[PDB]
Amino acid sequence: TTALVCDNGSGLVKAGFAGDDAPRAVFPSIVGRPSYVGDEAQSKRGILTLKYPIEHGIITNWDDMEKIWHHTFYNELRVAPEEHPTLLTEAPLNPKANREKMTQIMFETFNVPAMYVAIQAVLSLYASGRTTGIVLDSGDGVTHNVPIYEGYALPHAIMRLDLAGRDLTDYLMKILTERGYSFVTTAEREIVRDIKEKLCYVALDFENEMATAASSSSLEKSYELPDGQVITIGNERFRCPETLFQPSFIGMESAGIHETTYNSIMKCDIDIRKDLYANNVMSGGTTMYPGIADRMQKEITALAPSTMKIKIIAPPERKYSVWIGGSILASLSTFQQMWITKQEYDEAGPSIVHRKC
Amino acid sequence: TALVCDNGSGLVKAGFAGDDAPRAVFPSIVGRSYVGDEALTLKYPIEHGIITNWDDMEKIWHHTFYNELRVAPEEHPTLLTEAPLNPKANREKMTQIMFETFNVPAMYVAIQAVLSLYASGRTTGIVLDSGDGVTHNVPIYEGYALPHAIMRLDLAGRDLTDYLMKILTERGYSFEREIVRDIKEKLCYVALDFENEMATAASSSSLEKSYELPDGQVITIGNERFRCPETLFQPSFIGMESAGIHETTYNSIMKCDIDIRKDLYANNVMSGGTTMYPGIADRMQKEITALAPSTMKIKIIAPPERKYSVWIGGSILASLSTFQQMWITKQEYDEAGPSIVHRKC
């Protein structure tokens, strides 16, 4: 009977049961054809063509997305969809047709008794115990700045940057190859992602850190490859996530995440800015770098009025903050009226989703 | 005390929540400034139900608050109305002006057809709303207007007035528009069987009516009485290629899911000044029944006060205890800005 929470991202699906403190299942948002989904597709990627049905947070391939949802319900969670209200998540500024399509598939294809669609960043805010603040959400495919007032994401101030964890992995691959190492096969890409997640960090002052990496071995770390070779990682440790603050590193002409944060706040009314500055919540896998909260604090402090109280909140579980916020929301007694029911769907159709979501 | 202001293409209807009728009704016109009766270039700031001239709309709202209602806006929560499918930016601008120009303590924007439905005591049904500038068919499920099934027809009261002018001219009269509008409202009616009414009009002792013009001339109107609103059912009368209001009603219902159609058919609510013609309900009953399945129960609801149904629905909504949470407050506006209207409306 328990409500399901399914958080669909560009790189990973997080799925589980409302009321749990973590998703039961986390797996790659991939569909492979010579069909296979998730883990069983990346372990067979030799005989398979791989596709990502979600690009930059947006569903773009509905056929493959149904396969993902099918895999989630039956293979991963082992439930009959018709027995479980299902909460889904979506990107900020998701096109209306997409929300209607998601609703149509849930009710007509999977026959869920009830459903709801929530904005991912809003769920992250909820997980931190807040209903007002500004979320920096950075995953595998997209980064957003999302200011939120009493659970409402302020649409004119939402910022989107199409640079996230996948780009950082690609960039680390490139600069490690420049240092003489070799990372080309898909198995070698997994090594680079492991290095990224284990050894990278965000420098407090990039240029000083570069200068420090150049005059001594003090910033260096060793990493043992699968075959037992030990390699040394130097300024690549912080050059890789520096891309978030300087998108020009990969040729992108956008402002970095500190400036888009500031720009987002400045697109909000003056009365709320004080609360946003004091409630910067970081969400997503790509906000996990050591040093990133402290760097953001420094950069926002430099942009904001000198009298402004600035606070960056970086929960330890923020890889799963979106999912956890969904788990919380779907557990609240005040939320149960908010479900869209199959009965309502029978009457109003897919556009009923705009009445409640 | 909450205010209710229902802004139309031709008329502003304004008053106090809890009253059974608007206290102020006046022309939605600005002349250059002059507003309403006292209005130069004439302009209608609302066209086919949509606000298109914001400077003039502020002049209208100013005239409404101070000159007509004699109130201080900052003391009253204000409910405004909007057309079906009103662009998001327009709803935000209305909100911005109410808070920043008139400093209301609270506000709300409701869809006009939905308010009309509420005024008839229902939350599910289909509304035919026909005013001065636009006609809509709006199917509604539990207070939610179904966006894919809404129909808009730019044929309404102003066009009928123009047409009455045209066909009276055919018989030798010369036009003066305000006079013809008055003739329309007092003497026109919808024939149950148009062709039969046309054929028999010469032998009816009841159909000719005299109308005393202001300067004192007595003129006679015959079959123009029912030819004028026949245009609603036959838009070809004015060279328009749309189906008539019976067919747009049917088409709107057919864009809704089959599960709700019985409830739509049984809850056909007519709203607006241009639905006031004697005979229009029975003509609709006939025409919709001819299109619908024979097993379908059809009911046309046409309240005597339906000229003001939108306003009355607003008066009711703004008086409900379950609605008080729905108001957008000055504090919320101060934090979130104009887009806050999408959270609550």
């Binding site: 049961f17 403190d21 883990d39 991963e76 115990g129 807040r130 209903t131 956890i324 005040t334 | 509420y118």
Partner: peptide, 26 residues
């Protein structure tokens, strides 16, 4: 319709009451 708090529950929610569960991820 017959006649014709939400945020506080979030702000005061106790996350320690959420169930521990094992996350499967490769």
């Amino acid at each position: 319709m017959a006649e014709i708090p939400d945020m506080a529950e979030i702000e005061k929610f106790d996350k320690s009451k959420l169930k521990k569960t094992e996350t499967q991820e490769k």
